[PDB]
Scaffold this motif. Sequence first.
Motif, PDB file in Angstrom:
ATOM      1  N   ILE A  17     -34.691  32.887 102.131  1.00 35.63           N
ATOM      2  CA  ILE A  17     -34.262  31.986 101.086  1.00 35.63           C
ATOM      3  C   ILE A  17     -35.330  31.963  99.993  1.00 35.63           C
ATOM      4  CG2 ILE A  17     -33.617  29.574 100.540  1.00 35.63           C
ATOM      5  CD1 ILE A  17     -32.656  29.105 103.197  1.00 35.63           C
ATOM      6  N   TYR A  18     -34.882  32.268  98.801  1.00 36.26           N
ATOM      7  CA  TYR A  18     -35.818  32.262  97.751  1.00 36.26           C
ATOM      8  C   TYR A  18     -35.128  31.780  96.507  1.00 36.26           C
ATOM      9  CZ  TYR A  18     -33.651  36.262  95.903  1.00 36.26           C
ATOM     10  OH  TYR A  18     -32.746  37.113  95.327  1.00 36.26           O
ATOM     11  N   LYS A  19     -35.936  31.389  95.509  1.00 39.38           N
ATOM     12  CA  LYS A  19     -35.417  30.865  94.254  1.00 39.38           C
ATOM     13  C   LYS A  19     -35.365  31.957  93.217  1.00 39.38           C
ATOM     14  CE  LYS A  19     -36.872  26.507  93.412  1.00 39.38           C
ATOM     15  NZ  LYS A  19     -37.745  25.323  93.334  1.00 39.38           N
ATOM     16  N   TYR A  25     -31.436  28.690  94.802  1.00 42.60           N
ATOM     17  CA  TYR A  25     -31.661  29.265  96.128  1.00 42.60           C
ATOM     18  C   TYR A  25     -30.898  30.535  96.333  1.00 42.60           C
ATOM     19  CZ  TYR A  25     -34.522  25.602  97.201  1.00 42.60           C
ATOM     20  OH  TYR A  25     -35.632  24.795  97.172  1.00 42.60           O
ATOM     21  N   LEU A  39     -33.196  22.570  99.379  1.00 41.90           N
ATOM     22  CA  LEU A  39     -33.468  23.499 100.480  1.00 41.90           C
ATOM     23  C   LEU A  39     -32.533  23.365 101.659  1.00 41.90           C
ATOM     24  CD1 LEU A  39     -34.532  25.845 101.281  1.00 41.90           C
ATOM     25  CD2 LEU A  39     -36.753  24.844 101.687  1.00 41.90           C
ATOM     26  N   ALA A  42     -29.527  24.692 101.007  1.00 41.72           N
ATOM     27  CA  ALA A  42     -29.480  26.146 101.010  1.00 41.72           C
ATOM     28  C   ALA A  42     -29.330  26.624 102.421  1.00 41.72           C
ATOM     29  CB  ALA A  42     -30.712  26.767 100.354  1.00 41.72           C
ATOM     30  N   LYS A  43     -30.255  26.095 103.181  1.00 40.69           N
ATOM     31  CA  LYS A  43     -30.357  26.454 104.547  1.00 40.69           C
ATOM     32  C   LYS A  43     -29.106  26.235 105.278  1.00 40.69           C
ATOM     33  CE  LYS A  43     -34.338  25.302 106.458  1.00 40.69           C
ATOM     34  NZ  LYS A  43     -35.015  26.348 107.252  1.00 40.69           N
TER      35      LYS A  43
END
Length: 164
Positions: A17-19, A25, A39, A42-43
């Motif tokens: 997971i990255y921006k 995300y 987050l 996102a997760k």
Amino acid sequence: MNIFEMLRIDEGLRLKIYKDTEGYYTIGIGHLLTKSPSLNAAKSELDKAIGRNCNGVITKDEAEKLFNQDVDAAVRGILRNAKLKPVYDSLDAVRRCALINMVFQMGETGVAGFTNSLRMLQQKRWDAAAAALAAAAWYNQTPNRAKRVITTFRTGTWDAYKNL
């Protein structure tokens, strides 16, 4: 070579997971998990995404899977586009790969932008258009990838991406 390979190289596979440039995300090769600044959110799209306890990370393969979903999504839009369609039906698998990349990179609208450019792709004028694409900002802003995408329209071989 194939499109995944070609994008791993042009957008790189991130297994966590990255921006993004936009700060949304993301995962793998540009998979947007969500636009909410969150987050855990996102997760979780992540988990519903592939389905399991990834806990902010995925497999090379899993990532591989999403990409597929993505690539499809794209093409879909591509067909679904007045301006593009004709150009892509006319193209050839590899040069199609090419059109995806751009579409990947700047959305239909964008690509849909490259007018006279697309025309030439249509009239299979592989030089004409190559230079014309070298002419746009996209080229200055992303020299390399753009150098590569253009060579792949030019020749219509993965040479530019390498080989075995």
